Design an enzyme around this catalytic site. Sequence first.
Site, PDB file in Angstrom:
ATOM      1  N   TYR A 135       0.796  -1.133  -0.120  1.00  0.00           N
ATOM      2  CA  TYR A 135      -0.086   0.059  -0.008  1.00  0.00           C
ATOM      3  C   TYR A 135       1.115   1.139   0.025  1.00  0.00           C
ATOM      4  CZ  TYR A 135      -2.779   3.749   2.558  1.00  0.00           C
ATOM      5  OH  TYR A 135      -3.104   4.724   2.899  1.00  0.00           O
TER       6      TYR A 135
ATOM      7  N   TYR B 250      -3.180   3.203  -4.308  1.00  0.00           N
ATOM      8  CA  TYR B 250      -1.898   3.745  -4.210  1.00  0.00           C
ATOM      9  C   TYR B 250      -0.824   2.688  -4.195  1.00  0.00           C
ATOM     10  CZ  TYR B 250       1.708   7.012  -2.571  1.00  0.00           C
ATOM     11  OH  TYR B 250       2.742   7.960  -2.656  1.00  0.00           O
TER      12      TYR B 250
ATOM     13  N   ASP C 162     -14.472   3.109 -12.758  1.00  0.00           N
ATOM     14  CA  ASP C 162     -13.735   3.573 -11.777  1.00  0.00           C
ATOM     15  C   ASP C 162     -13.887   5.030 -11.754  1.00  0.00           C
ATOM     16  OD1 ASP C 162     -11.969   4.154  -9.626  1.00  0.00           O
ATOM     17  OD2 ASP C 162     -10.742   2.478  -9.898  1.00  0.00           O
TER      18      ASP C 162
END
Lengths: 726, 728
Positions: free
Chosen positions: B509, B593, B670
Amino acid sequence: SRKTYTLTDYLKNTYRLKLYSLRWISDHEYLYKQENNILVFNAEYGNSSVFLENSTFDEFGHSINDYSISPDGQFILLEYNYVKQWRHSYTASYDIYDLNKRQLITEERIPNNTQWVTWSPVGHKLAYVWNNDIYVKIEPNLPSYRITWTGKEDIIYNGITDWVYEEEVFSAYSALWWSPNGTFLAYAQFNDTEVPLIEYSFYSDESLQYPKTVRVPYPKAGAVNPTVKFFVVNTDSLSSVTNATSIQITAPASMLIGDHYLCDVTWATQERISLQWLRRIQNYSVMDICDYDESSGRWNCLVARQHIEMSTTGWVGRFRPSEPHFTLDGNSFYKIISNEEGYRHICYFQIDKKDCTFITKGTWEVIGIEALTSDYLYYISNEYKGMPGGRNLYKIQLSDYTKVTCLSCELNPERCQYYSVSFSKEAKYYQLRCSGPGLPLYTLHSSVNDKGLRVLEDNSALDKMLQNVQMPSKKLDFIILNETKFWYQMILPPHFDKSKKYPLLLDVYAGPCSQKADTVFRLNWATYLASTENIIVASFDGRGSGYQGDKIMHAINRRLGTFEVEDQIEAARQFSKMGFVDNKRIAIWGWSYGGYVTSMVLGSGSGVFKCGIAVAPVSRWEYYDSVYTERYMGLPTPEDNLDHYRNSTVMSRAENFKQVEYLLIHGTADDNVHFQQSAQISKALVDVGVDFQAMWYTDEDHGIASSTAHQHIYTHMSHFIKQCFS
Amino acid sequence: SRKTYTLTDYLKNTYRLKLYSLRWISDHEYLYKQENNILVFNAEYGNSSVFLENSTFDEFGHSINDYSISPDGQFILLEYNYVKQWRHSYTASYDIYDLNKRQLITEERIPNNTQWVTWSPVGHKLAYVWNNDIYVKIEPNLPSYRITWTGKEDIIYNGITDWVYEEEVFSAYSALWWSPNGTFLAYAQFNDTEVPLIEYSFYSDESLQYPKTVRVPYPKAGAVNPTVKFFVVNTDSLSSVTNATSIQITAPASMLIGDHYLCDVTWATQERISLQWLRRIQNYSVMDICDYDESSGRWNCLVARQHIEMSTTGWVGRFRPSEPHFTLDGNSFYKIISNEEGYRHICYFQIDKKDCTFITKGTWEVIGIEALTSDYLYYISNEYKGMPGGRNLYKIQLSDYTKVTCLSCELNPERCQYYSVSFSKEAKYYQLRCSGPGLPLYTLHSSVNDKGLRVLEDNSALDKMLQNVQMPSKKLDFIILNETKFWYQMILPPHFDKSKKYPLLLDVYAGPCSQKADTVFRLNWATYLASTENIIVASFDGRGSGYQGDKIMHAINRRLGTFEVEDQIEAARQFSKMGFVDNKRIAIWGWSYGGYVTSMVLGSGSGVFKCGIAVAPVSRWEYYDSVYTERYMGLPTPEDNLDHYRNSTVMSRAENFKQVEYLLIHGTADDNVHFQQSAQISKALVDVGVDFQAMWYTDEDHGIASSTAHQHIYTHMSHFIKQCFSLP
Ligand SMILES: C[C@H](CCc1ccc(C(N)=O)cc1)NCC(=O)c1ccc(F)cc1
Ligand SMILES: C[C@H](CCc1ccc(C(N)=O)cc1)NCC(=O)c1ccc(F)cc1
């Protein structure tokens, strides 16, 4: 010893096929766009002269991609700032170079962003479209004459086609036709007012922060279609004081009753124009022959002068009704139409006589009428040796249909079985273009005695190049199914040993009037797969196939996604039962319609194919355009053919993909077969739990033809195939 | 002999973690949903007493998604016809059931497609937002008063957030706050008029002939941002006027001078509200305290009462300025802010005093303040054993800050090191939620002496089912980087053998204030990878990671895509040298991310990774939203930080991808990390001739959480990973 034709060879195009592209400017000479400068050749003797130096436009300030020399020879049209749009359309900037004073015209110049431009058929007149409106320049430096004032982006098109007319009917962006001597300028007007818009995102360069939405009027199966109008303008009669008067040619009534199309427009004489209309139900088409009225200034289309063309077994023409070819006085004409036996041959008409007389006949078809003189009719057909996959140029004496001569058949039977031709203005000479089975050969001939004058390009360079490599061979044969013979071809690996079992890849198209088994010589993906990977690449022309009569071609009428996919399967079974085919390693791939078929096949549950690749395929006929779809599927309504529309989708076959390894590819900017089509296949596969491979190509269209994208897609497919086969 | 946790077990949820969801309704009572009938337990003993029986809502012909009972327990709101919008937003159908007369209210019903509904904190008042406008119902059966008349889809939002505020500031769709009395209704108004629209295709079901183009006001980095306004209305005066007047609360002056954001809103007292505002340049923040002038009927916000909170080393707060917790009289409050050492701790404030006093320690951080009484302040922190990935409940004496008591540290130290809590109305009781490292454990305690009353759920069931399957273990430790230790976690395959070399997958992450190394127990994809495929699944928290002080978290300020990427790489180098890791089989993967990082790592050319998977990754910050992006990168202008915006893209590293196997994945619908980001990544890879694997998910968003897409994506990644590792 030596080497194989590799993927790098193909993608880097290390072995180039040399062509010979000449543009006839007279009946005696032609221009040959050499690499540096443009030379002029004298068809007869063979003596050449330069037309314009390569340097001529160095300091032009712009990079020129094309030149259009007026039929005058006085002016040259310079095209640059070329920006591609759909398959044929595009916008660019033009400059007019005066060959007399040798200067570049600078006054009343042609607008940037020009959509289309064309010299008249004789002088130095000009007609062009800018901002969807038509303009005319009688002389290069004189002001343009606004012909039309209704142009409006995505709503009204004057002189140019809308999306569907570009792709499916005119196969061109242009929508204007100069009369033979340049007096009249005819044009169509398209109205897309109520036509739905297809919308997709275009990401453009990295620098673009927000994606842009591209919207183009596009009628999908059964939607509101654009409407059309036809007009004629007298360029000799327009001033600068008053606006131009467009004389409209309307109807026919039998057509105005409902949705229809303008499928063809050919000038007969200086004062006679023929128009062919098509009903939305492409069953019926009517040709009108209209004459200019002297003491009235209008155009009259006399009934009795109009010809009806229909089909009871399918649609009209292969893709659309054929083009008529009028005689000198324009009182009679020749045109290809379907036999009483379903075969396409040339028929002879008198503009005021209903019943025509077929001048050719046989169990083969005339591919096209190439040239018409008062003496002979030149045409290409596949009559030779009963091979539907071959092409030869013939000439028939118009006085005696018994006197027919094949001008190409015997020139070199081993190397050449697929010809095309380019005749001079009065067909005094012609360039024969042999494209297979051997290496492409371009020759020049004189029509008087049909003598071969000289070879223009024999690809001797390539021949010395390839003797170095291990090239694959090609077998072109047929199998017999229920009384009919169906052709197929196979790209066979070098040193082919029928003792060994080779993996096989079925290369498919299979759409209506398609032909994949031919005698053409090619250097492509399949070449590499056979040469380097030792894969047999086969193609089969089954039901729905073209150039073999209507019984075959019309077999899938109103039934797309049925017999053509089955015959593809049936054919693979046969190949798999030939002994040299590894039945556990058979794959299938198709682009476009081939993508759809490849998909229907993979979801058929046949059990024949381990894997398959589908590139930019159609997934449900309601997503594809009206003109093309409806031509075979009728209308997507319960009163018509809705049931089959709904029964022939790839998504309904999703469960069956559990048995195969599938690769799905599609450019995100495909304006033709919308990304939406593959987006719906992927979703059906996901909802039913089917793993598969996928690849999108951002900003690429139906061709996925940008240089990098092209290298990327074939490299990717190559990996998939080898993995599936090793 | 013995089995494992398989991909199927994960996708089919064969082994389920039992939870114990309480909903306090008083100081000693809570409701417990029994999937059929809601019961009211008495914390003191643990009595039953049904509240609503098994089949009270049959013949309702509708599937009740959720329920909400009025504070005074006289009414129950029913929610159905649920329709998800963004991450928190959704439209739904509502109906109210009168418990007194056991009847369903049919008159003046709330409109279908309601965007948000809330009972007032006391009694049974109701406020809901419909068509971007606010409505209030004094009584469920009475007609509602429309509070605002400017609501306009995609333009003006009243009582609800626009896309960017929902996602990046309030982590909620709601934008209305009832005063603790129910007297006042406060709300925000967002104007998106000038905000650009992100546009993308939605294909819908097969039947849809023409694709749809979804258009959403979404400000990317540096673009025009939405504007905000704040108002307050008195609901007890709605029945005396005609057209309710919403009193506006403007400023602060230091905010109005330029672009800003409504940061936080918390009522202090019955007539004292606190608002926090933040500048677009997120290193400066101001709290505003306003009292209700019962004379003018306005709200006077003494400028002298303002509180600034800024950062010299980065932005303010972890993701935003923290929330204030006011004492009973509203004259003082506790709020977490980073001290001079850069560690987030609690400090006491007086509304009339700009200087605050810190009440908590050093080298660790307070995660959040959980409860306030006149006696003690309860908070959660990672101070125990200096493990930033642990979580415990502590209580500190308000009269003597040196008296700090950990309430959960020793309950069961070997099984519980990650707690969350839920106090009753007056914090008279509280439920402790142990999330790991052992199987979740829920217990009830009483605040007088923090005595354990009883175990609510111990997951003994799951426990039994798992003693027969070879479950993986979790190693939680640290490595050293430049004099500072950074934590990592490893999910180890059963009967781990230090002598054999195991392939390794780095699950990352690594975004600002992220933490992937913790004491939490999970049953996820990594569980299967370890238990069945014998893959070591590790996660590392390097520079930029959170809960360990600003020195570490602010290291990547204005420098996104640098140290955080590098550290992820350095950790793998260390893992590879570890001896039981197979050097030639280290993969890396991340979502969001983590997708950006994974892609940046694979394009670094460090030669450490054999393959990787990036799901819905960001590719260049200019494509992302302003609030999240600028917070760490400043603006994309030559004057500010444009140079690093351009030096931190995935595409510019395309060439290095030639040495790795890359799987790029993304949902076409998205709305957060637009498909565009991956679309640009593949194009750059295509432009430099690098082959990779790809997968788009039709009509799926950032969560690709559709039942089928979820199973399909994990199934797809499994094949890729074990293929890259040469399993199967
Ligand atoms: C203008 C073209 C000409 C006909 C044609 C040519 C080649 C293919 C071919 N190679 O498949 C299929 C059809 N029609 C539209 C088109 O490109 C098309 C039609 C159907 C489809 F499924 C995809 C694309
Ligand atoms: C609302 C969230 C909360 C913070 C957050 C949570 C999880 C991740 C995570 N698992 O990566 C990344 C960032 N921020 C916006 C967001 O979804 C985001 C930020 C950055 C990015 F590259 C993608 C998405």
